[PDB]
Amino acid sequence: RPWNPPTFSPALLVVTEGDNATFTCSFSNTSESFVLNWYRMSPSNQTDKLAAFPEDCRFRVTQLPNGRDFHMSVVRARRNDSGTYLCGAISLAPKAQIKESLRAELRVTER
Amino acid sequence: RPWNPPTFSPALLVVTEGDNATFTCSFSNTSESFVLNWYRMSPSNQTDKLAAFPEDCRFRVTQLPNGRDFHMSVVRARRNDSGTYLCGAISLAPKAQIKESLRAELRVTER
Amino acid sequence: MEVQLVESGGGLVQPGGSLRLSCAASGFTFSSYMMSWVRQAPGKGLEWVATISGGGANTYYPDSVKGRFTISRDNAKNSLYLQMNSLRAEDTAVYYCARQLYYFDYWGQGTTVTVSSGGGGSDIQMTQSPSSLSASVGDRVTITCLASQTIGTWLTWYQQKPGKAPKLLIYTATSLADGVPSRFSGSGSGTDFTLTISSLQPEDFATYYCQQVYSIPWTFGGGTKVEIKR
Amino acid sequence: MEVQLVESGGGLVQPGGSLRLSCAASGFTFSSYMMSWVRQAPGKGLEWVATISGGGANTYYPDSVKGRFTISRDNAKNSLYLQMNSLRAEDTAVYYCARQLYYFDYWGQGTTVTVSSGGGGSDIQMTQSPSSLSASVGDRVTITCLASQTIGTWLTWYQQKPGKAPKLLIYTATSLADGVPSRFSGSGSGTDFTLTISSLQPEDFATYYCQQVYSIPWTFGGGTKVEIKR
Ligand SMILES: *[C@@H]1O[C@H](CO[C@@H]2O[C@@H](C)[C@@H](O)[C@@H](O)[C@@H]2O)[C@@H](O[C@@H]2O[C@H](CO)[C@@H](O[C@H]3O[C@H](CO)[C@@H](O)[C@H](O[C@H]4O[C@H](CO)[C@@H](O)[C@H](O)[C@@H]4O)[C@@H]3O)[C@H](O)[C@H]2NC(C)=O)[C@H](O)[C@H]1NC(C)=O
Ligand SMILES: *[C@@H]1O[C@H](CO[C@@H]2O[C@@H](C)[C@@H](O)[C@@H](O)[C@@H]2O)[C@@H](O[C@@H]2O[C@H](CO)[C@@H](O[C@H]3O[C@H](CO[C@H]4O[C@H](CO)[C@@H](O)[C@H](O)[C@@H]4O)[C@@H](O)[C@H](O)[C@@H]3O)[C@H](O)[C@H]2NC(C)=O)[C@H](O)[C@H]1NC(C)=O
Ligand SMILES: *[C@@H]1O[C@H](CO[C@@H]2O[C@@H](C)[C@@H](O)[C@@H](O)[C@@H]2O)[C@@H](O[C@@H]2O[C@H](CO)[C@@H](O)[C@H](O)[C@H]2NC(C)=O)[C@H](O)[C@H]1NC(C)=O
Ligand SMILES: *[C@@H]1O[C@H](CO[C@@H]2O[C@@H](C)[C@@H](O)[C@@H](O)[C@@H]2O)[C@@H](O[C@@H]2O[C@H](CO)[C@@H](O)[C@H](O)[C@H]2NC(C)=O)[C@H](O)[C@H]1NC(C)=O
Ligand SMILES: *[C@@H]1O[C@H](CO)[C@@H](O)[C@H](O)[C@H]1NC(C)=O
Ligand SMILES: *[C@@H]1O[C@H](CO)[C@@H](O)[C@H](O)[C@H]1NC(C)=O
Ligand SMILES: *[C@@H]1O[C@H](CO)[C@@H](O)[C@H](O)[C@H]1NC(C)=O
Numbered sequence: 001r002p003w004n005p006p007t008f009s010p011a012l013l014v015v016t017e018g019d020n021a022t023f024t025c026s027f028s029n030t031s032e033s034f035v036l037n038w039y040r041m042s043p044s045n046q047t048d049k050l051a052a053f054p055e056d057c058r059f060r061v062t063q064l065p066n067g068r069d070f071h072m073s074v075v076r077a078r079r080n081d082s083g084t085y086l087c088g089a090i091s092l093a094p095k096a097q098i099k100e101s102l103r104a105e106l107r108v109t110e111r
Numbered sequence: 112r113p114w115n116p117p118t119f120s121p122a123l124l125v126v127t128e129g130d131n132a133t134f135t136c137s138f139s140n141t142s143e144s145f146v147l148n149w150y151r152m153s154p155s156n157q158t159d160k161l162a163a164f165p166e167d168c169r170f171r172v173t174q175l176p177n178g179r180d181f182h183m184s185v186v187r188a189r190r191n192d193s194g195t196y197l198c199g200a201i202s203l204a205p206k207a208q209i210k211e212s213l214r215a216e217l218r219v220t221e222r
Numbered sequence: 223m224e225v226q227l228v229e230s231g232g233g234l235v236q237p238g239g240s241l242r243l244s245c246a247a248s249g250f251t252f253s254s255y256m257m258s259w260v261r262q263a264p265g266k267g268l269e270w271v272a273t274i275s276g277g278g279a280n281t282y283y284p285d286s287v288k289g290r291f292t293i294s295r296d297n298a299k300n301s302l303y304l305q306m307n308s309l310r311a312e313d314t315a316v317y318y319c320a321r322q323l324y325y326f327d328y329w330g331q332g333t334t335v336t337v338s339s340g341g342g343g344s345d346i347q348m349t350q351s352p353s354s355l356s357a358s359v360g361d362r363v364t365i366t367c368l369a370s371q372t373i374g375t376w377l378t379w380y381q382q383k384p385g386k387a388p389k390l391l392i393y394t395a396t397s398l399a400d401g402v403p404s405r406f407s408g409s410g411s412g413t414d415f416t417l418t419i420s421s422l423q424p425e426d427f428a429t430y431y432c433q434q435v436y437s438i439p440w441t442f443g444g445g446t447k448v449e450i451k452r
Numbered sequence: 453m454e455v456q457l458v459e460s461g462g463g464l465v466q467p468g469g470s471l472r473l474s475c476a477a478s479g480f481t482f483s484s485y486m487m488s489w490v491r492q493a494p495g496k497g498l499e500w501v502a503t504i505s506g507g508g509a510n511t512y513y514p515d516s517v518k519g520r521f522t523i524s525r526d527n528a529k530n531s532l533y534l535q536m537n538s539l540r541a542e543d544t545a546v547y548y549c550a551r552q553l554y555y556f557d558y559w560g561q562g563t564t565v566t567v568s569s570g571g572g573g574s575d576i577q578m579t580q581s582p583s584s585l586s587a588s589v590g591d592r593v594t595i596t597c598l599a600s601q602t603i604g605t606w607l608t609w610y611q612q613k614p615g616k617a618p619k620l621l622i623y624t625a626t627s628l629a630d631g632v633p634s635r636f637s638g639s640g641s642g643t644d645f646t647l648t649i650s651s652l653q654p655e656d657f658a659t660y661y662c663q664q665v666y667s668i669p670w671t672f673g674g675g676t677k678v679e680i681k682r
Contacts, residue, residue, distance in 0.1 A: 007361070009357045009358070009361040009362065009363070010352075010355040010356055010357040010361065010363065010451075011356050011357060011358065011451050012354075012355060012356040012449075012451065013352050013355060014352060014353045014354040014355065015351075015352050015353060016353055019349075019351070019352075020351075020366070021352065022351070022352075022364060022366075024361070024362055024363075024364065026361075026362065069362055071364075109353060118591070120587045120588070120591035120592060120593070121582075121585045121586055121587035121591065121593065122586050122587060122588065122681050123584075123585070123586045123679075123681075124582065124584075124585065125582075125583055125584035125585070126581055126582060126583050127583055130579070130581045130583070131581050131596070132581070132582075133581070133582075133594060133596070135591075135592055135594060137591075137592060180592055182594070220583075236518075237515065237518035237519045238513070238518045238519050260618075267659075267661060267672055267673070267674055267675040268610070268612075268618065268661055268663070268672040268675075269671075269672060270669055270670045270671070270672070282668050284575075284668070284669040285468060285538075285669075286468070286538060289537075308519050308522070309519055310518070310519030310520060310538075311519070313519075318617055318618075324606065324608075324623065324624070324665045325608045325620055325623040325629075325665065326608075326610070326618070326620060327620045327629070329617040329618055329619070330617065331616065331617050332617060337519070339515050339518070341515055376554065378555045378556070380498075380556070382498075386561075387548050387559035387560065387561055387562055388490075388498065388548075388556070388559055389559070390555055390556060390557060393554065393555040394554070394555075399555075431497060431498055433498075433556075435554050435555065438503075438512055438514070439500065439514040439515070440500040440503075441499070441500075442497055442498040442499060442500070443497070444497055445497045445498075
């Protein structure tokens with residue numbers, strides 16, 4: 001069962017502080033046996049998990065009802081929230097396996 | 112013969128930067144045997160001598176023909192020229208004595 | 223007998239309104255002296271506004287009031303007039319009439335003219351979602367707009383591509399303009415509104431603006447630039 | 453025909469200049485639609501600037517342009533106009549005309565209006581140096597006034613006591629007005645002038661202005677305020 005990793009759009013978000021920064025992770029899923037994870041890269045350059053679908057407080061994931069897309073938002077985004085973000089699909093269908101997205105950049109502009 | 116110290120008018124000057132800020136030292140001299148100095152209070156309270164009469168290029172002293180008044184001006188006054196100023200009468204007369212005037216303030220506003 | 227100049231006519235006017243000023247003269251032969259209005263806004267200095275000749279045959283104005291202001295005199299009534307049309311907020315001042323030869327020797331005590339607007343800060347302000355973004359061809363982008371006050375569904379979406387005028391995309395916040403592809407979608411009502419591009423195409427390289435049409439001043443959002451990234 | 457909106461009139465102007473924009477329409481019943489002028493600063497977003505109803509009986513402006521801008525239309529010639537008076541640096545923008553409904557339907561390709569920072573004055577600019585002052589009674593006070601061009605001796609000094617109108621002190625830069633004390637001195641010619649109070653008195657507490665009467669517009673100085681410490 002060869003399946004492709006999810007995609008994480010947009011590649012660059014430039015949000016003013018205090019607003020809601022919304023990424024969109026899209027996953028063409030071979031099965032229903034999977035969860036989704038939203039990672040943010042640390043200064044140590046490995047994934048820190050923020051939130052997962054299904055289930056912090058400022059990191060909410062929602063399932064867009066088209067069966068393909070997910071909204072992963074930063075509510076009241078702070079300045080130091082700028083960094084590298086990505087999503088990852090964890091399949092539970094035969095052979096548990098994690099396939100990360102392409103990393104995307106977030107920039108928060110000061111008011 | 113007790114001679115009175117010079118007077119330094121005006122007590123406060125509010126000139127916009129780039130303009131000429133002129134003070135007036137008035138001295139009712141008893142003798143012709145005197146010289147004048149123009150001081151500026153440095154942050155350490157040390158009275159810094161700017162110019163003298165007779166004699167930096169920005170600090171000029173001119174003698175008015177009435178035999179009493181002197182014009183002491185700051186040509187193209189910069190903003191940090193703001194501070195405390197005063198004139199001073201040195202007496203080369205039978206006894207050598209310095210008599211400073213009442214200090215005055217100068218403010219240089221922005222354009 | 224002393225010379226006296228008495229001004230009347232000042233009042234509150236809205237910007238673009240009109241006002242007329244009078245000045246009653248006495249104490250000299252009014253027919254042979256030049257008259258003029260000099261004004262002074264609050265906290266500022268003096269500035270000259272208009273001048274009429276003694277016989278009224280010659281008038282003079284600065285460029286700031288030309289076409290707007292018209293000085294006139296009625297030598298029979300010994301009075302001076304200043305007609306002020308299309309008033310601006312900069313015209314707020316105390317207006318003195320004065321006798322003019324090569325100095326203003328006699329001045330009236332002035333009448334106060336105020337040009338102001340009560341609109342103040344009751345304007346609706348629109349803010350837009352990511353300020354800019356960079357996605358690839360085929361991605362699903364979503365753009366939000368926010369209104370300072372409730373505007374129902376009176377929100378509009380425009381698309382402006384570089385070097386071109388804005389194109390109407392969505393009106394009444396859900397409807398789709400003629401000739402717009404079906405991939406553009408609009409949602410929301412009251413304060414929060416969203417523009418969604420179902421599948422980014424190469425011809426969607428643009429900046430997108432929102433606009434409320436509920437009440438004047440009709441305000442726009444800051445815009446959201448969408449770069450098709452390398 | 454086919455719907456068409458073409459703008460004309462743009463160009464470069466100096467601050468305080470005048471400009472008139474023309475927008476010509478075709479392809480629809482012009483006398484029935486609202487017409488608009490929307491501008492965009494060279495780097496900023498969109499802001500609405502004027503609107504006129506189909507019959508021309510209703511106008512609407514934002515507060516920033518009221519008193520300066522005037523929208524008008526000639527339905528017989530199917531054209532729209534915008535009279536921009538006393539232009540500021542904030543008016544540099546591309547100016548589009550747009551057929552207006554509860555949305556902006558069709559947009560012209562816009563004309564470009566550029567407000568320079570060229571030309572300083574064109575009028576003689578007076579400059580008073582001391583600009584505010586506090587001296588004790590009996591001190592000697594010196595107020596200088598600088599003219600941009602040569603004005604010969606055509607220089608006037610005015611005193612404005614608090615709450616009252618300006619009063620003539622000195623005319624032609626040296627001669628003293630009647631009823632003025634002898635402690636007031638005037639000197640200078642051409643560009644450099646000086647008002648001297650030989651001995652300050654409490655009744656000299658006022659604001660002093662210089663003014664050239666050489667050429668129009670007759671310009672004043674910024675004023676020099678004289679407080680009295682004691
Ligand atoms: C790809 O994944 C999506 C998403 O799946 C959901 O989310 C992930 C995170 C997991 O948690 C999954 O377990 C979730 O299901 C798939 O999307 C779902 O597909 C199912 C397939 O039907 C949808 O099903 C159900 O819910 C609706 C109500 O919302 C029911 O009415 C459906 O039908 C029943 O009732 C019928 C009569 O009324 C009867 O005929 C049926 O027998 C049945 O009992 C059904 O139970 C679900 O709603 C979908 N969710 C979303 C968000 O789209 C997608 O199928 C996956 N694709 C592949 C190829 O695997
Ligand atoms: C108080 O001081 C003033 C000024 O003193 C002068 O300045 C100080 C700083 C020192 O350098 C002194 O050495 C200076 O004198 C007194 O005044 C001076 O008195 C002189 C006579 O005693 C008088 O005389 C000479 O010059 C006359 C022509 O003057 C020309 O130059 C002056 C500038 O100095 C100028 O104003 C004038 O228009 C002329 O161009 C001449 O007619 C005389 O015969 C004589 O040769 C000085 O002019 C005069 N200086 C000033 C500036 O007024 C004053 O006497 C002192 N008072 C007391 C009580 O001592
Ligand atoms: C930023 O988002 C918050 C919360 O986000 C919402 O929930 C997410 C899971 C996702 O579905 C988003 O699309 C939603 O908008 C907004 O929060 C308000 O929160 C208060 C509680 O403090 C609640 O009472 C309100 O109902 C919420 N409002 C809405 C519209 O959900 C917040 O308004 C958003 N801010 C901006 C500027 O958009
Ligand atoms: C500022 O001053 C200069 C010269 O200063 C003079 O000295 C002072 C003590 C003061 O009392 C001034 O009245 C004096 O003029 C002004 O410039 C000069 O203009 C003359 C014209 O004849 C010329 O010959 C000089 O060389 C010029 N000197 C300089 C330094 O420019 C200058 O215009 C003054 N500016 C203002 C705003 O007052
Ligand atoms: C970000 O800034 C907040 C201040 O509001 C601080 O509490 C938080 O620890 C910071 N986090 C990082 C990762 O810098
Ligand atoms: C010295 O400085 C103080 C303030 O630090 C000031 O009050 C005082 O007048 C100054 N004295 C002299 C002689 O400068
Ligand atoms: C004042 O500003 C000038 C710059 O014009 C600078 O060279 C000088 O060192 C400054 N002096 C002080 C005391 O700040």
